[PDB]
């Protein structure tokens, strides 16, 4: 029994790890076959039977949630040790987003324009 | 002939609209105008070392 979460914009990934499935479709069969590499990066830079349920947002966010979940779900494998302390170091020397969630979210729209900064054209004549 | 030289300090923004940056480039202390972003310990490739920046 191991619990793990992963987030990108509105994508939430749930991981049950026990002594590999993403939406019942195994690892290298997840739709974006180009970003499959991006998913599989931690497994090869660093098994058990893990299991994932992820929703929210879009494709790329799904990828950056499942990947980060699997990273944490094997980061919590050994406990209170120097491997427990250096795995996260190799993950950071790959990218710090491999542990800490990305906190950016869309800024709300304000009247007199299409988006958060674009106004409408100003005509004097 | 390229004349690569090295900056050893930034003096300040020269152009009226910001823009260019006076630097102390180098056994010499020639001073020159620079267009883009430059830190210390960076490198400029100089077409000539004959002239030094006004002021």
């Amino acid at each position: 029994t191991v619990h793990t979460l992963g987030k990108k914009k509105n994508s939430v990934a749930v991981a049950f790890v026990k002594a590999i499935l993403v939406n019942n479709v195994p690892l290298a069969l997840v739709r974006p076959e180009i970003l499959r590499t991006k998913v599989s990066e931690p497994i090869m830079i660093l098994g058990l039977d893990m299991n994932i349920k992820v929703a929210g947002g879009g494709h790329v966010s799904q990828i950056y949630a499942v990947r980060q979940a699997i990273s944490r779900g094997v980061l919590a494998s050994v406990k209170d040790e120097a491997a427990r302390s250096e795995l996260r170091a190799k993950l950071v020397s790959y990218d710090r987003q491999l542990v800490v969630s990305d906190p950016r979210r869309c800024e709300a729209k304000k009247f007199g324009g299409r988006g958060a900064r674009a106004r409408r054209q100003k005509s004097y004549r | 002939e390229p004349i690569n030289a090295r900056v050893i300090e930034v003096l300040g923004r020269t152009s009226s609209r910001g823009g260019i940056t006076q630097v102390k480039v180098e056994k010499r202390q020639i001073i020159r105008n620079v267009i883009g972003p430059v830190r210390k310990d960076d490198i400029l490739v100089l077409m000539e070392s004959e002239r030094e920046a006004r002021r």
């Binding site: 990218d95 | 152009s15 260019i20 267009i35």
Partner: protein
């Protein structure tokens, strides 16, 4: 263009590396060059955002360089984006040396504009232009639009002193 701004060590396999780079100031100095390129590829409102498709070009153009020259697809890249980068400028116009960080930056944009204009209304592929364009700004030949205009900007700067 120098060994303090061409990233060839800190980089994930494929270009795509979502995160943050324009938040700081000299942060994009550690942005992998093979990503700085694709980043530029998604230019024009008609391609604003498309990152995967831009990726379908860099790796593919890397399928014509070895098939014509025979040299590692990336060594031509770094040297090509080093060959460009106007050395001077004509800012009351005085000649001023150009920043090392800037040349790496401006030159990447130059190779992209080469293909963009030389692919439109052409049966020939757009990635095809990036192909010859990137292998044209390799040895050093006017055929490469980039190599040419770089020469033009030095002519004005040396004459605008």
């Amino acid at each position: 263009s120098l060994e303090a701004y061409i990233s060839i060590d800190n980089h994930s396999f494929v270009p795509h590396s979502a995160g943050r780079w324009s938040a700081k100031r000299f942060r994009k100095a550690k942005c992998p060059v093979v990503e700085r390129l694709t980043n530029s590829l998604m230019m024009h409102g008609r391609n604003s955002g498309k990152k995967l498709m831009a990726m379908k070009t860099v790796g593919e153009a890397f399928e014509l360089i070895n098939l014509y020259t025979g040299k590692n697809p990336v060594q031509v890249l770094v040297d090509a984006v080093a060959n460009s980068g106007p050395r001077e400028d004509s800012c009351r116009r005085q000649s001023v040396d150009v920043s090392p960080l800037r040349r790496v930056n401006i030159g990447i944009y130059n190779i992209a504009t080469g293909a963009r204009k030389a692919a439109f209304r052409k049966v020939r592929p757009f990635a095809e232009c990036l192909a010859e364009e990137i292998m044209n700004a390799a040895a050093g030949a006017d055929k490469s639009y980039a190599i040419s205009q770089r020469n033009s900007v030095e002519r004005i700067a040396v004459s605008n002193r």
